[PDB]
Structure 1
Amino acid sequence: RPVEWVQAVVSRFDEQLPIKTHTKVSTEHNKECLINISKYKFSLVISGLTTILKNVNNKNLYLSQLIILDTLEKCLAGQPETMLVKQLLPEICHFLQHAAELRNSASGVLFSLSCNNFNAVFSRISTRLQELTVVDVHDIELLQYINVDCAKLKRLLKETAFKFKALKKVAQLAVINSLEKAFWNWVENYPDEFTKLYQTDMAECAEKLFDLVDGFAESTKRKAAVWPLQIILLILCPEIIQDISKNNMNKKLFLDSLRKALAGHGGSRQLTESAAIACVKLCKASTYISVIFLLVQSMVVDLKNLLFNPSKPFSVDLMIDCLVSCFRISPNQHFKICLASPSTFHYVLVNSLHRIITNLDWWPKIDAVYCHSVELRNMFGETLHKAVQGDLETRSYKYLLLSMVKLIHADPKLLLCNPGSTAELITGLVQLVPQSHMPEIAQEAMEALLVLHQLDSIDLWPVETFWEISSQMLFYICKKLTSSSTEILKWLREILICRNKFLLKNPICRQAQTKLEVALYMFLWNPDTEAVLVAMSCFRHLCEEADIRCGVPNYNTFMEFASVRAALQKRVMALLRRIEHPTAGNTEAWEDTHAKWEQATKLILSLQEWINMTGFLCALGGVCLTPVSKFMDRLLSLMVCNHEKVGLQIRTNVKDLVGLELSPALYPMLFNKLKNTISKFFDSQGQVLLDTNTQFVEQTIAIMKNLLDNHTEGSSEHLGQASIETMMLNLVRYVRVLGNMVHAIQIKTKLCQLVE
């Protein structure tokens, strides 16, 4: 019965789609199992996914389709024909901000499909070409996406050339654009095959199609449309390029027209703009390799004077393609222009460098650029300064800064290698992490700082530098955290992992460790459950740091945090009570939380945060044994909180938190303060001063009952330290003078239950 269980995995995966944490893990685990099943029973899994995709097609819809298409792509990329062609391929055609993601995903699916399927996708394309000869072009666009090799490219060109004159003008246009991408698809995937082309049937197809496409070009607009393909088709004819460098006359007149259009002598802006696109594509093509270099040398200077002119800016992806190509051709005049200049040039430079890192054996590596690191650092500092001090100009500095941080994520080594310099760089990134108005930048600054904290990076900043800089970052981040906090805290966990790794290979440090300790304790009360769990995880790394340092007080309780909404807060408070030993950190965390809590209390007189802060103060406060005395007096004043909208909730939560969660080491202070307060309810003749006092007494009885019910280990030791006798006598004496009404009877009953 294997088929039946494969279908059960497929059916599980379908029902777990968003359109219909554990469901995330289950979904990914199912997807990964389907992929690994597809590695063998490929058509069962693909059929199921196809069937699901049909059903789904007939925010959560897009996410479901993305999950299905990502699964399909990874299955197809793992492939060791009929329904691929008759069932899947039409659905992938149907797909061809989430629409662009879906188009990208579907294209990756189609690319993967096409690798082993090509003859079928080409048969669909060839059939629509035939239909177009006797206008709906969408199947022709599939040529953009499909995997193409040298033999397949030759076939596509041959099929096209034969039919091209019989096609309608809109179909001819769709073909022209689509073949331009199809050429690039081959060159990018199979650079070795393009290199071999420069080391006659392809050239015959390319020349035939060139002359056909030239015959189509009857107007300025059609000329501008075809020139990017005509340069490709000419690049597919190395021997024609060699002849026209000295039947070919129209190819020479085309290159001359491109030169004239780059040099500004063509009046038509559309032809100059198109000529830029064509000559960038030529420059690009040369990097994947020859006579082509002479053609590049004839146009590159005019192309640079078109795209990189600070006095007359062109009208970014095209400029990036140009700069990357120029760098690959010769690894810097236009580079210095981009370092100096319009912010759009800074943008194009940085994105070009990022592409150079992230995208062949003869291509120059990024390391030639490590002469310009000082200028890149200056550009970063300036851009940072301009983004923070900030409408259209401001928005442009944001996109630039994001790109510079992405560049730092792509490679730190550049910045560090030419060079305080490192401290400035890290400080600037660190300054972005807090910024609420730029979440995308902050996220990337964190990733950048993380890769800057990997071993190989730190060496380039060693140990005396690591300590100073990394602690300064920690101290600053923690100081902000104690003033997207959750994501910053996750990242701070991975930074601590990196620090532990760096020390395992091995005054601001004490300050940083203390502020970190403060921050982590302050996260234990945070209203976000995820934040609390992450903070717990951070104590593990604080312990690991100390193990690594010491191997050359709280540690047991930190390891218990590491081992771990209302249930979690209860568990946290139970652990906080087990902190016996004072530290600068825990003390300061208590004082800061107390200060915040007093401010929040005034504002209240957000509630769940105040409850959690209250609980934390109650649980940790023993370490501080004054500020604690004042907090306890304030809690006692809140037991009788008369506030109309939040008073019941305040009284209930103070009662429950004092009664279940207070530190055992504070019981001696609590009983003295309760005693002293209740004693004020009597005059000098020992008569009872009878609503506030009655309410205090009821809450006191419940609080004391809850304390005495509690079996927290070590609580017995502290219960002994202060006498209850005068307090309990005063409680019963107070309750005796309450009349025989229902509420007073309940209070008498509760006091009996306390006494028991």
Structure 2
Amino acid sequence: RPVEWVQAVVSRFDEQLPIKTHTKVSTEHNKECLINISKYKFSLVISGLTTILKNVNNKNLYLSQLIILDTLEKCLAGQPETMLVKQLLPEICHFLQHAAELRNSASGVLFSLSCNNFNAVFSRISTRLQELTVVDVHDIELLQYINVDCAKLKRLLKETAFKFKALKKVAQLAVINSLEKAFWNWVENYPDEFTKLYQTDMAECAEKLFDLVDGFAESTKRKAAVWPLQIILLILCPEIIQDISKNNMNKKLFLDSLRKALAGHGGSRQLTESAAIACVKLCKASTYISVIFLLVQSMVVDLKNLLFNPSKPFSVDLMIDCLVSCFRISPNQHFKICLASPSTFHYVLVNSLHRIITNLDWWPKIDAVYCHSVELRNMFGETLHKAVQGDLETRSYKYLLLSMVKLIHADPKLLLCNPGSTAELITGLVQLVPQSHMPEIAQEAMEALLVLHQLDSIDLWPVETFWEISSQMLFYICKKLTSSSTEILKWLREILICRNKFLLKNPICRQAQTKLEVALYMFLWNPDTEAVLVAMSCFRHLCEEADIRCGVPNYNTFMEFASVRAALQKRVMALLRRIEHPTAGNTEAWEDTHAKWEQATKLILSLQEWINMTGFLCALGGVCLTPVSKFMDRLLSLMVCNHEKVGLQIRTNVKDLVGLELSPALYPMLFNKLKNTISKFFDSQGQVLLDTNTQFVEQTIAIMKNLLDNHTEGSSEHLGQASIETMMLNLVRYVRVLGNMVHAIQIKTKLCQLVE
């Protein structure tokens, strides 16, 4: 019965789609199992996914389709024909901000499909070409996406050339654009095959199609449309390029027209703009390799004077393609222009450098650029300064800064290698992490700082530098955290992992460790459950740091945090009570939380945060044994909180938190303060001063009952330290003078239950 269980995995995966944490893990685990099943029973899994995709097609819809298409792509990329062609391929055609993601995903699916399927996708394309000869072009666009090799490219060109004159003008246009991408698809995937082309049937197809496409070009607009393909088709004819460098006359007149259009002598802006696109594509093509270099040398200077002119800016992806190509051709005049200049040039430079890192054996590596690191650092500092001090100009500095941080994520080594310099760089990134108005930048600054904290990076900043800089970062981040906090805290966990790794290979440090300790304790009360769990995880790394240092007080309780909404807060408070030993950190965390809590209390007189802060103060406060005395007096004042909208909730939560969660080491202070307060309810003749006092007494009885019910280990030791006798006598004496009404009877009953 294997088929039946494969279908059960497929059916599980379908029902777990968003359109219909554990469901995330289950979904990914199912997807990964389907992929690994597809590695063998490929058509069962693909059929199921196809069937699901049909059903789904007939925010959560897009996410479901993305999950299905990502699964399909990874299955197809793992492939060791009929329904691929008759069932899947039409659905992938149907797909061809989430629409662009879906188009990208579907294209990756189609690319993967096409590798082993090509003859079928080409048969669909060839059939629509035939239909077009006797206008709906969408199947022709599939030529953009499909995997193409040298033999397949030759076939596509041959099929096209034969039919091209019989096609309608809109179909001819769709073909022209689509073949331009199809050429690039081959060159990018199979650079070795393009290199071999420069080391006659392809050239015959390319020349035939060139002359056909030239015959189509009857107007300025059609000329501008075809020139990017005509340069490709000419690049597919190395021997024609060699002849026209000295039947070919129209190819020479085309290159001369491109030169004239780059040099500004063509009046038509559309032809100059198109000529830029064509000559960038030529420059690009040369990097994947020859006579082509002579053609590049004839146009590159005019192309640089078109795209990189600070006095007359062109009208970014095209400029990036140009700069990357120029760098690959010769690894810097236009580079210095981009370092100096319009912010759009700074943008194009940085994105070009990022592409150079992230995208062949003869291509120059990024390391030639490590002469310009000082200028890149200056550009970063300036851009940072301009983004923070900030409408259209401001928005442009944001996109630039994001790109510079992405560049730092792509490679730190550049910045560090030419060079305080490192401290400035890290400080600038660190300054972005807090910024609420730029979440995308902050996220990337964190990733950048993380890769800057990997071993190989730190060496380039060693140990005396690591300590100073990394602690300064920690101290600053923690200081902000104690003033997207959750994501910053996750990242701070991974930074601590990196610090532990760096020390395992091995005054601001004490300050940083203390502020970190403060921050982590302050996260234990945070209203976000995820934040609390992450903070717990951070104590593990604080312990690991100390193990690594010491191997050359709280540690047991930190390891218990590491081992771990209302249930979690209860568990946290139970652990906080087990902190016996004072530290600068825990003390300061208490004082800061107390200060915040007093401010929040005034504002209240957000509630769940105040409850959690209250609980934290109650649980940790023993370490501080004054500020604690004042907090306890304030809690006692809140037991009788008369506030109309939040008073019941305040009284209930103070009662429950004092009664279940207070530190055992504070019981001696609590009983003295309760005693002293209740004693004020009597005059000098020992008569009872009878609503506030009655309410205090009821809450006191419940609080004391809850304390005495509690079996927290070590609580017995502290219960002994202060006498209850005068307090309990005063409680019963107070309750005796309450009349025989229902509420007073309940209070008498509760006091009996306390006494028991």
Partner of 2:20, secondary structure, is coil
Between the aligned partners of 2:567 and 2:392, the Cα distance in structure 1 is 49
Counterpart for residue 230 of structure 1: 230
1:690-714 superposed Cα distances (whole Å, 9 cap, x missing partner): 0000000000000000000000000
How far the C-alpha of 1:162 sits from its partner, in A, is 0.0
How far the C-alpha of 1:588 sits from its partner, in A, is 0.0
How far the C-alpha of 1:70 sits from its partner, in A, is 0.0
Partner of 1:609, secondary structure, is helix
Between the aligned partners of 2:606 and 2:288, the Cα distance in structure 1 is 60
Counterpart for residue 563 of structure 2: 563
How far the C-alpha of 1:121 sits from its partner, in A, is 0.0
1:365-412 superposed Cα distances (whole Å, 9 cap, x missing partner): 000000000000000000000000000000000000000000000000
Partner of 2:495, secondary structure, is helix
1:479-516 superposed Cα distances (whole Å, 9 cap, x missing partner): 00000000000000000000000000000000000000
1:716-755 superposed Cα distances (whole Å, 9 cap, x missing partner): 0000000000000000000000000000000000000000
Partner of 1:286, secondary structure, is helix
How far the C-alpha of 1:338 sits from its partner, in A, is 0.0
1:132-162 superposed Cα distances (whole Å, 9 cap, x missing partner): 0000000000000000000000000000000
How far the C-alpha of 1:670 sits from its partner, in A, is 0.0
How far the C-alpha of 1:257 sits from its partner, in A, is 0.0
Counterpart for residue 179 of structure 1: 179
1:276-324 superposed Cα distances (whole Å, 9 cap, x missing partner): 0000000000000000000000000000000000000000000000000
Between the aligned partners of 2:198 and 2:700, the Cα distance in structure 1 is 92
Between the aligned partners of 2:575 and 2:48, the Cα distance in structure 1 is 50
How far the C-alpha of 1:51 sits from its partner, in A, is 0.0
How far the C-alpha of 1:243 sits from its partner, in A, is 0.0
Between the aligned partners of 2:571 and 2:707, the Cα distance in structure 1 is 17
Counterpart for residue 696 of structure 1: 696
Between the aligned partners of 2:451 and 2:20, the Cα distance in structure 1 is 38
Between the aligned partners of 2:254 and 2:641, the Cα distance in structure 1 is 87
Between the aligned partners of 1:549 and 1:730, the Cα distance in structure 2 is 55
User: What pairs with 1:236-255 in structure 2 (closer than 5 Å)?
Assistant: 236-255=236-255
How far the C-alpha of 1:198 sits from its partner, in A, is 0.0
Between the aligned partners of 2:321 and 2:628, the Cα distance in structure 1 is 65
Counterpart for residue 620 of structure 2: 620
Between the aligned partners of 1:188 and 1:648, the Cα distance in structure 2 is 69
1:595-614 superposed Cα distances (whole Å, 9 cap, x missing partner): 00000000000000000000
1:414-451 superposed Cα distances (whole Å, 9 cap, x missing partner): 00000000000000000000000000000000000000
1:591-644 superposed Cα distances (whole Å, 9 cap, x missing partner): 000000000000000000000000000000000000000000000000000000
Between the aligned partners of 2:146 and 2:101, the Cα distance in structure 1 is 17
How far the C-alpha of 1:172 sits from its partner, in A, is 0.0
1:175-207 superposed Cα distances (whole Å, 9 cap, x missing partner): 000000000000000000000000000000000
Gaps of 5+ in 1: none
Partner of 2:73, secondary structure, is helix
How far the C-alpha of 1:39 sits from its partner, in A, is 0.0
Between the aligned partners of 2:363 and 2:660, the Cα distance in structure 1 is 68
Gaps of 5+ in 2: none
Partner of 2:314, secondary structure, is coil
Between the aligned partners of 2:695 and 2:350, the Cα distance in structure 1 is 68
Between the aligned partners of 1:400 and 1:492, the Cα distance in structure 2 is 25
How far the C-alpha of 1:5 sits from its partner, in A, is 0.0
Counterpart for residue 94 of structure 1: 94
Partner of 2:264, secondary structure, is coil
Between the aligned partners of 2:346 and 2:35, the Cα distance in structure 1 is 43
What is the number of residues matched between the two proteins? Answer: 756
Partner of 2:628, secondary structure, is helix
Partner of 1:685, secondary structure, is coil
1:648-686 superposed Cα distances (whole Å, 9 cap, x missing partner): 000000000000000000000000000000000000000
Between the aligned partners of 2:465 and 2:77, the Cα distance in structure 1 is 45
How far the C-alpha of 1:551 sits from its partner, in A, is 0.0
- CA RMSD, 1 decimal: 0.0
Between the aligned partners of 1:340 and 1:487, the Cα distance in structure 2 is 36
Between the aligned partners of 1:209 and 1:118, the Cα distance in structure 2 is 22
User: What pairs with 1:255-404 in structure 2 (closer than 5 Å)?
Assistant: 255-404=255-404
Between the aligned partners of 2:643 and 2:163, the Cα distance in structure 1 is 84
How far the C-alpha of 1:461 sits from its partner, in A, is 0.0
User: What pairs with 1:302-701 in structure 2 (closer than 5 Å)?
Assistant: 302-701=302-701
Between the aligned partners of 1:24 and 1:364, the Cα distance in structure 2 is 42
How far the C-alpha of 1:20 sits from its partner, in A, is 0.0
1:454-484 superposed Cα distances (whole Å, 9 cap, x missing partner): 0000000000000000000000000000000
Between the aligned partners of 1:467 and 1:721, the Cα distance in structure 2 is 45
Between the aligned partners of 1:613 and 1:339, the Cα distance in structure 2 is 51
Partner of 2:582, secondary structure, is coil
Check if 1:707 corresponds to 2:707: yes
How far the C-alpha of 1:267 sits from its partner, in A, is 0.0
1:41-93 superposed Cα distances (whole Å, 9 cap, x missing partner): 00000000000000000000000000000000000000000000000000000
Q: Post-superposition, which runs of at least 4 consecutive aligned residues in structure 1 deviate over 4 A?
A: none
Between the aligned partners of 2:38 and 2:90, the Cα distance in structure 1 is 20
Partner of 2:79, secondary structure, is coil
Percent identity of the aligned residues? 100
Between the aligned partners of 2:454 and 2:148, the Cα distance in structure 1 is 39
1:194-248 superposed Cα distances (whole Å, 9 cap, x missing partner): 0000000000000000000000000000000000000000000000000000000
- Report the TM-score when normalising by structure 1: 1.00
Counterpart for residue 129 of structure 1: 129
Between the aligned partners of 2:510 and 2:578, the Cα distance in structure 1 is 24
Between the aligned partners of 2:163 and 2:383, the Cα distance in structure 1 is 53
Between the aligned partners of 1:233 and 1:550, the Cα distance in structure 2 is 69
How far the C-alpha of 1:113 sits from its partner, in A, is 0.0
1:569-599 superposed Cα distances (whole Å, 9 cap, x missing partner): 0000000000000000000000000000000
Check if 1:211 corresponds to 2:211: yes
Between the aligned partners of 1:575 and 1:215, the Cα distance in structure 2 is 82
Counterpart for residue 43 of structure 1: 43
- Report the TM-score when normalising by structure 2: 1.00
Between the aligned partners of 1:146 and 1:128, the Cα distance in structure 2 is 16
Between the aligned partners of 1:744 and 1:340, the Cα distance in structure 2 is 83
Between the aligned partners of 1:336 and 1:212, the Cα distance in structure 2 is 42
Between the aligned partners of 1:229 and 1:73, the Cα distance in structure 2 is 29
Between the aligned partners of 2:507 and 2:489, the Cα distance in structure 1 is 24
How far the C-alpha of 1:107 sits from its partner, in A, is 0.0
Between the aligned partners of 1:148 and 1:690, the Cα distance in structure 2 is 92
Between the aligned partners of 1:120 and 1:493, the Cα distance in structure 2 is 51
Between the aligned partners of 1:599 and 1:387, the Cα distance in structure 2 is 33
Between the aligned partners of 2:177 and 2:262, the Cα distance in structure 1 is 21
1:304-353 superposed Cα distances (whole Å, 9 cap, x missing partner): 00000000000000000000000000000000000000000000000000
How far the C-alpha of 1:119 sits from its partner, in A, is 0.0
Between the aligned partners of 1:162 and 1:474, the Cα distance in structure 2 is 67
